[PDB]
Design an enzyme around this catalytic site. Structure first.
Site, PDB file in Angstrom:
ATOM      1  N   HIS A  93      11.564   4.084   0.957  1.00  0.00           N
ATOM      2  CA  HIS A  93      10.139   3.781   1.211  1.00  0.00           C
ATOM      3  C   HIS A  93       9.852   2.283   1.233  1.00  0.00           C
ATOM      4  CE1 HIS A  93       6.022   5.822   0.508  1.00  0.00           C
ATOM      5  NE2 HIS A  93       5.861   4.758   1.274  1.00  0.00           N
ATOM      6  N   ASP A 148       4.259  12.805   8.623  1.00  0.00           N
ATOM      7  CA  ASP A 148       4.786  11.727   7.767  1.00  0.00           C
ATOM      8  C   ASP A 148       4.280  11.917   6.338  1.00  0.00           C
ATOM      9  OD1 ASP A 148       6.184   8.990   7.627  1.00  0.00           O
ATOM     10  OD2 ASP A 148       4.272   8.713   6.533  1.00  0.00           O
ATOM     11  N   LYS A 165      10.051  10.167   2.049  1.00  0.00           N
ATOM     12  CA  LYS A 165      10.470   8.841   1.612  1.00  0.00           C
ATOM     13  C   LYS A 165      10.808   8.855   0.153  1.00  0.00           C
ATOM     14  CE  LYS A 165       6.942   7.057   4.854  1.00  0.00           C
ATOM     15  NZ  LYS A 165       5.801   7.945   4.497  1.00  0.00           N
ATOM     16  N   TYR A 212       2.633   9.991  -2.303  1.00  0.00           N
ATOM     17  CA  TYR A 212       1.316  10.358  -1.809  1.00  0.00           C
ATOM     18  C   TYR A 212       0.718  11.512  -2.630  1.00  0.00           C
ATOM     19  CZ  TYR A 212       2.794   7.620   2.291  1.00  0.00           C
ATOM     20  OH  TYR A 212       3.307   6.648   3.134  1.00  0.00           O
ATOM     21  N   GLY A 243      21.258  12.021  17.601  1.00  0.00           N
ATOM     22  CA  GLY A 243      21.102  12.976  18.668  1.00  0.00           C
ATOM     23  C   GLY A 243      19.825  13.796  18.635  1.00  0.00           C
ATOM     24  N   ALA A 244      19.014  13.641  17.599  1.00  0.00           N
ATOM     25  CA  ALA A 244      17.778  14.398  17.469  1.00  0.00           C
ATOM     26  C   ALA A 244      16.663  13.643  18.162  1.00  0.00           C
ATOM     27  CB  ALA A 244      17.423  14.621  16.011  1.00  0.00           C
ATOM     28  N   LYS A 245      15.632  14.389  18.542  1.00  0.00           N
ATOM     29  CA  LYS A 245      14.483  13.807  19.212  1.00  0.00           C
ATOM     30  C   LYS A 245      13.282  13.831  18.270  1.00  0.00           C
ATOM     31  N   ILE A 267       6.767  11.107  19.162  1.00  0.00           N
ATOM     32  CA  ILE A 267       6.218   9.771  19.067  1.00  0.00           C
ATOM     33  C   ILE A 267       4.833   9.695  18.425  1.00  0.00           C
ATOM     34  CG2 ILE A 267       7.618   8.877  20.966  1.00  0.00           C
ATOM     35  CD1 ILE A 267       5.124   8.768  22.690  1.00  0.00           C
ATOM     36  N   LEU A 268       4.171  10.820  18.266  1.00  0.00           N
ATOM     37  CA  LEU A 268       2.894  10.873  17.542  1.00  0.00           C
ATOM     38  C   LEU A 268       3.059  11.801  16.364  1.00  0.00           C
ATOM     39  CD1 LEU A 268      -0.059  10.179  17.336  1.00  0.00           C
ATOM     40  CD2 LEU A 268      -0.524  11.509  19.261  1.00  0.00           C
ATOM     41  N   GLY A 269       2.755  11.329  15.165  1.00  0.00           N
ATOM     42  CA  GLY A 269       2.771  12.135  13.986  1.00  0.00           C
ATOM     43  C   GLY A 269       1.496  11.999  13.188  1.00  0.00           C
ATOM     44  N   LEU A 270       1.319  12.896  12.241  1.00  0.00           N
ATOM     45  CA  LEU A 270       0.196  12.874  11.324  1.00  0.00           C
ATOM     46  C   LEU A 270       0.555  12.180  10.034  1.00  0.00           C
ATOM     47  CD1 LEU A 270      -2.757  13.987  10.752  1.00  0.00           C
ATOM     48  CD2 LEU A 270      -1.587  15.830   9.518  1.00  0.00           C
ATOM     49  N   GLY A 271      -0.192  11.130   9.686  1.00  0.00           N
ATOM     50  CA  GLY A 271      -0.056  10.503   8.394  1.00  0.00           C
ATOM     51  C   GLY A 271      -0.786  11.249   7.273  1.00  0.00           C
TER      52      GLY A 271
HETATM   53  N1  LIG Z   1       5.919   3.451   4.855  1.00  0.00           N
HETATM   54  C1  LIG Z   1       4.894   2.950   4.181  1.00  0.00           C
HETATM   55  O1  LIG Z   1       4.954   2.063   3.318  1.00  0.00           O
HETATM   56  C2  LIG Z   1       3.521   3.362   4.688  1.00  0.00           C
HETATM   57  C3  LIG Z   1       2.395   2.536   4.332  1.00  0.00           C
HETATM   58  C4  LIG Z   1       1.105   2.853   4.822  1.00  0.00           C
HETATM   59  C5  LIG Z   1       0.959   3.979   5.650  1.00  0.00           C
HETATM   60  N2  LIG Z   1       2.074   4.793   5.925  1.00  0.00           N
HETATM   61  C6  LIG Z   1       1.957   6.068   6.693  1.00  0.00           C
HETATM   62  O2  LIG Z   1       1.132   5.793   7.830  1.00  0.00           O
HETATM   63  C7  LIG Z   1      -0.037   6.666   7.833  1.00  0.00           C
HETATM   64  C8  LIG Z   1      -1.149   6.000   8.575  1.00  0.00           C
HETATM   65  O3  LIG Z   1      -1.612   4.788   7.862  1.00  0.00           O
HETATM   66  P1  LIG Z   1      -2.876   4.728   6.913  1.00  0.00           P
HETATM   67  O4  LIG Z   1      -3.097   6.037   6.245  1.00  0.00           O
HETATM   68  O5  LIG Z   1      -2.682   3.519   6.067  1.00  0.00           O
HETATM   69  O6  LIG Z   1      -4.089   4.413   7.863  1.00  0.00           O
HETATM   70  P2  LIG Z   1      -4.606   4.637   9.382  1.00  0.00           P
HETATM   71  O7  LIG Z   1      -3.951   5.801   9.967  1.00  0.00           O
HETATM   72  O8  LIG Z   1      -4.534   3.316  10.017  1.00  0.00           O
HETATM   73  O9  LIG Z   1      -6.188   4.902   9.094  1.00  0.00           O
HETATM   74  C9  LIG Z   1      -6.578   6.112   8.420  1.00  0.00           C
HETATM   75  C10 LIG Z   1      -8.097   5.934   8.202  1.00  0.00           C
HETATM   76  O10 LIG Z   1      -8.740   6.025   9.478  1.00  0.00           O
HETATM   77  C11 LIG Z   1      -9.666   7.070   9.554  1.00  0.00           C
HETATM   78  N3  LIG Z   1      -9.637   7.644  10.881  1.00  0.00           N
HETATM   79  C12 LIG Z   1      -8.650   8.431  11.425  1.00  0.00           C
HETATM   80  N4  LIG Z   1      -8.849   8.804  12.662  1.00  0.00           N
HETATM   81  C13 LIG Z   1     -10.079   8.193  12.963  1.00  0.00           C
HETATM   82  C14 LIG Z   1     -10.818   8.252  14.176  1.00  0.00           C
HETATM   83  N5  LIG Z   1     -10.479   8.889  15.265  1.00  0.00           N
HETATM   84  N6  LIG Z   1     -12.025   7.563  14.138  1.00  0.00           N
HETATM   85  C15 LIG Z   1     -12.431   6.876  13.005  1.00  0.00           C
HETATM   86  N7  LIG Z   1     -11.725   6.790  11.844  1.00  0.00           N
HETATM   87  C16 LIG Z   1     -10.550   7.511  11.879  1.00  0.00           C
HETATM   88  C17 LIG Z   1      -9.256   8.055   8.472  1.00  0.00           C
HETATM   89  O11 LIG Z   1     -10.395   8.759   7.977  1.00  0.00           O
HETATM   90  P3  LIG Z   1     -10.338  10.343   7.572  1.00  0.00           P
HETATM   91  O12 LIG Z   1      -8.933  10.625   7.105  1.00  0.00           O
HETATM   92  O13 LIG Z   1     -11.392  10.440   6.503  1.00  0.00           O
HETATM   93  O14 LIG Z   1     -10.732  11.090   8.837  1.00  0.00           O
HETATM   94  C18 LIG Z   1      -8.709   7.087   7.378  1.00  0.00           C
HETATM   95  O15 LIG Z   1      -9.776   6.526   6.633  1.00  0.00           O
HETATM   96  C19 LIG Z   1      -0.224   6.961   6.344  1.00  0.00           C
HETATM   97  O16 LIG Z   1      -1.122   7.974   6.065  1.00  0.00           O
HETATM   98  C20 LIG Z   1       1.236   7.166   5.909  1.00  0.00           C
HETATM   99  O17 LIG Z   1       1.611   8.464   6.359  1.00  0.00           O
HETATM  100  C21 LIG Z   1       3.347   4.482   5.466  1.00  0.00           C
HETATM  101  O1  LIG Z   2       3.709   2.949   0.092  1.00  0.00           O
HETATM  102  C1  LIG Z   2       2.928   3.432   0.971  1.00  0.00           C
HETATM  103  O2  LIG Z   2       3.246   4.301   1.805  1.00  0.00           O
HETATM  104  C2  LIG Z   2       1.506   2.929   1.018  1.00  0.00           C
HETATM  105  C3  LIG Z   2       1.085   2.252  -0.233  1.00  0.00           C
HETATM  106  N1  LIG Z   2       1.060   0.982  -0.213  1.00  0.00           N
HETATM  107  N2  LIG Z   2       0.707   0.277  -1.347  1.00  0.00           N
HETATM  108  C4  LIG Z   2       1.035  -1.154  -1.244  1.00  0.00           C
HETATM  109  C5  LIG Z   2       2.439  -1.461  -1.662  1.00  0.00           C
HETATM  110  N3  LIG Z   2       3.055  -2.579  -1.588  1.00  0.00           N
HETATM  111  C6  LIG Z   2       4.341  -2.529  -2.057  1.00  0.00           C
HETATM  112  C7  LIG Z   2       5.249  -3.578  -2.084  1.00  0.00           C
HETATM  113  C8  LIG Z   2       6.530  -3.302  -2.619  1.00  0.00           C
HETATM  114  C9  LIG Z   2       7.565  -4.410  -2.653  1.00  0.00           C
HETATM  115  F1  LIG Z   2       8.643  -4.034  -1.820  1.00  0.00           F
HETATM  116  F2  LIG Z   2       7.084  -5.530  -2.098  1.00  0.00           F
HETATM  117  F3  LIG Z   2       8.121  -4.640  -3.832  1.00  0.00           F
HETATM  118  C10 LIG Z   2       6.883  -2.026  -3.100  1.00  0.00           C
HETATM  119  C11 LIG Z   2       5.949  -0.953  -3.063  1.00  0.00           C
HETATM  120  C12 LIG Z   2       4.701  -1.286  -2.535  1.00  0.00           C
HETATM  121  S1  LIG Z   2       3.403  -0.141  -2.343  1.00  0.00           S
HETATM  122  C13 LIG Z   2       0.300   0.800  -2.502  1.00  0.00           C
HETATM  123  O3  LIG Z   2      -0.012   0.088  -3.456  1.00  0.00           O
HETATM  124  C14 LIG Z   2       0.303   2.290  -2.569  1.00  0.00           C
HETATM  125  C15 LIG Z   2      -0.093   2.994  -3.727  1.00  0.00           C
HETATM  126  C16 LIG Z   2      -0.069   4.387  -3.781  1.00  0.00           C
HETATM  127  C17 LIG Z   2       0.350   5.089  -2.660  1.00  0.00           C
HETATM  128  C18 LIG Z   2       0.821   4.410  -1.521  1.00  0.00           C
HETATM  129  C19 LIG Z   2       0.692   3.009  -1.444  1.00  0.00           C
END
Ligand SMILES: NC(=O)c1ccc[n+]([C@@H]2O[C@H](COP(=O)([O-])OP(=O)(O)OC[C@H]3O[C@@H](n4cnc5c(N)ncnc54)[C@H](OP(=O)(O)O)[C@@H]3O)[C@@H](O)[C@H]2O)c1
Ligand SMILES: O=C(O)Cc1nn(Cc2nc3cc(C(F)(F)F)ccc3s2)c(=O)c2ccccc12
Length: 314
Positions: free
Chosen positions: A109, A42, A76, A47, A8-10, A13-17
């Protein structure tokens, strides 16, 4: 601006990574983000910056810029805490660091459990990640308890393939369905099958690395570069937008949540200015056509883990 979740929460659609946002810079990044309108952040324990994210949020709450109910904070559960007995403490550590009394969303995660201990990536002497003897369903049951205790409002998963999602959905006695599956998604990894799967099951998809993660620590010079792709630059020019703006708008028009990362104030503001233009049908078709099944995030040392998600087609 927001999408309805199963609780039920909203969710905005845009967040900060925040992966790779150094503690030296992430406090200012989050402050600027909140000032220019971001309401979703996020986060993750892995991290290594949740304390500094927390400082920023606390300050903006205290300045009366935003109220807590207006923010949507995601974190996460890291892989070394998949044991049922470790989950609550991991969540509470994140809450303490973030200076919060609840999370809006808490994700598993990765589907893989790693050996518990201080190291985030425990390796053997030959470089293989050391797994733990944990399973998805027991970890999920531990996550459900966090909802029941009020620590988190919603739970979900990240980097789960469709069979792994199905495992949870099919659990006899399931208490909470995953609200979200957060996956890598961008024009070089368009995820058509997994998105159709998730959306058909009522699970919201969040697209990570939407700009192709140029700052990822394992980048190679011969790798594809989304932000430098001249084809995408041409679509951006046609709309008098930047390539990053096009890459952020793209998943929005697929009914995805998207979480671009920046620590650069000018980019944080630029990246939010994506609600004032529309990509055309042809633009969307063209961007989807660039798929190459190319992944930013898939650590080699994990490929023998029993729960490695990316051996499956989707
Ligand atoms: N669940 C998971 O396993 C997982 C895995 C990967 C990522 N994530 C989440 O997703 C987020 C986003 O992914 P990401 O950090 O991998 O990469 P991303 O958002 O695809 O790219 C970030 C990179 O792009 C640069 N950038 C940002 N805005 C820009 C713009 N307008 N013009 C030019 N360059 C720009 C940033 O530089 P600066 O920061 O130096 O400006 C940084 O080097 C993460 O930070 C994390 O919160 C989750
Ligand atoms: O995690 C983030 O958000 C970004 C992220 N990605 N990766 C690549 C990864 N590949 C994986 C594959 C598995 C697997 F499930 F395949 F075992 C498990 C865990 C990982 S981490 C990294 O190695 C990492 C290191 C430090 C901080 C964040 C990250």
């Amino acid at each position: 601006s927001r999408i309805l979740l199963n609780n039920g929460a909203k969710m905005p659609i845009l967040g900060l990574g925040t992966w790779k946002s150094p503690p030296g810079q992430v406090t200012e990044a989050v402050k600027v983000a909140i000032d220019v309108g971001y309401r979703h952040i996020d986060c993750a324990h892995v991290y290594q910056n949740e304390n500094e994210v927390g400082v920023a949020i606390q300050e903006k709450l205290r300045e009366q810029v935003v109220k807590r109910e207006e923010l949507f904070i995601v974190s996460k559960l890291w892989c070394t805490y998949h044991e049922k007995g470790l989950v609550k403490g991991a969540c509470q550590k994140t809450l303490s660091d973030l200076k919060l009394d609840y999370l809006d969303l808490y994700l598993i995660h990765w589907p893989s459990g790693f050996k518990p201990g201080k190291e985030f990536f425990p390796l053997d002497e030959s470089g293989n990640v050391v797994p733990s003897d944990t399973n998805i369903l027991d970890t999920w049951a531990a996550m459900e308890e966090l909802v029941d205790e009020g620590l988190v409002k919603a739970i979900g998963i990240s980097n789960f393939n469709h069979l792994q999602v199905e495992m949870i959905l099919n659990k006899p006695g399931l208490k909470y369905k995953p609200a979200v599956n957060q996956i890598e998604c961008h024009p070089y990894l368009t995820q058509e099958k997994l998105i159709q799967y998730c959306q058909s099951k009522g699970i919201v998809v969040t697209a990570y690395s939407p700009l192709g993660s140029p700052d990822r620590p394992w980048a190679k010079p011969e790798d594809p570069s989304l932000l430098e792709d001249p084809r995408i630059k041409a679509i951006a020019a046609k709309h008098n937008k930047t390539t990053a703006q096009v890459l952020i708008r793209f998943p929005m028009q697929r009914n995805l949540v998207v979480i671009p990362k920046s620590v650069t104030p000018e980019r944080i503001a630029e990246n939010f200015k994506v609600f004032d233009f529309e990509l055309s049908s042809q633009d969307m078709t063209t961007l989807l056509s660039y798929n190459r099944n190319w992944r930013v995030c898939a650590l080699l040392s994990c490929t023998s883990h029993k729960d490695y998600p990316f051996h499956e087609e989707f």
